[PDB]
């Protein structure tokens, strides 16, 4: 599924990402935009054999188990397939554990490169929430 910008903002607010561990809602909408372009089925195979899954491109090396990645650690204790659903529940749950690490949202390369330091609030502006 490909979310509309406002559609995802509302969903993420419902999934408790409005001010989760010091990160305003705009951060998550922006991250999703540049990580997957709001596409829940997005996947990207990496050189280390790992794959990034879902709307928030969660990596199979540290966060989810897709059973095909070398030194997998499965920190989110969840199968990567669960992150490829039109239902963002699992992606949000795992993303919350990821951001609870000291590295914060810096785990998301696209967020770091295109959102951090910008007016992220703009991403939820003009939306019925």
């Amino acid at each position, epitope marked *: 599924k490909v979310f509309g910008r406002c559609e995802l903002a509302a969903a993420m607010k419902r999934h*408790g990402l409005d001010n989760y561990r010091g990160y305003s809602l705009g951060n998550w909408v922006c991250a999703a935009k540049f990580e997957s372009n709001f596409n829940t089925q997005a996947t990207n195979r990496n050189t280390d054999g790992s794959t990034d899954y879902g709307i928030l491109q969660i990596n199979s090396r540290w966060w989810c188990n897709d059973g095909r990645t070398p030194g997998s650690r*499965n*920190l989110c204790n969840i199968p990567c397939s669960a992150l490829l659903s039109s239902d963002i529940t699992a992606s949000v749950n795992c993303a919350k554990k990821i951001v609870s690490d000291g590295n914060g949202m810096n785990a998301w390369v696209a967020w770091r490169n295109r959102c951090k330091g910008t007016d992220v609030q703009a991403w939820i502006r003009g939306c019925r929430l």
Partner: antibody
Amino acid sequence: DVQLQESGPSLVKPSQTLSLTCSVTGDSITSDYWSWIRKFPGNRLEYMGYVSASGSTYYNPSLKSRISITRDTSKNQYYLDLNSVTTEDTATYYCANWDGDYWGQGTLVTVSA
Amino acid sequence: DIVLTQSPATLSVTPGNSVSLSCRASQSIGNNLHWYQQKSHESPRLLIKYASQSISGIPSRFSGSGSGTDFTLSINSVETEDFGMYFCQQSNSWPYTFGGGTKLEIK
């Protein structure tokens, strides 16, 4: 599957450092976030803190920086050190993973002269 | 810190009857509210995560609802094994905090 178990002294003196160990069996400590929680005599629970995958720690400000949570991969154990304890630190201590799916059995530590 | 207030402090019920336990937060925490059960001489057991998400291995009679500042844990048809303490905990902001707990006893 995963198993957690606390170990350490059950009686300590005021002003000393209370140290507990949580032994993890079933998987590597490098594969989860680990925490410490304690229950005071009044049935009051306090989340003490946790150490995540990057080694970063989060400590409850209530502990006024007397706490340290460390890990030992080789022994597949993590620890809790609480400095300058007082009778206010008497409680039942538990270790559990961040998700809250796995908990230790809990261990009572009494601080007394 | 975020303060969680649970009510009632104690609740007596006859097995077979249903009950609802309240937990309200001092500020909005979205859906980041979890429920734990704890019996004497035992470690807490996670019953519901993120306000209403079910947990594998937990009896289906337990359900959670709410968002923002008001949350409830419901038990459809209480069983004797359900008597004990119930605590809510928020993970929206550090430090994580627990409500004062609600004791469920047989009437």
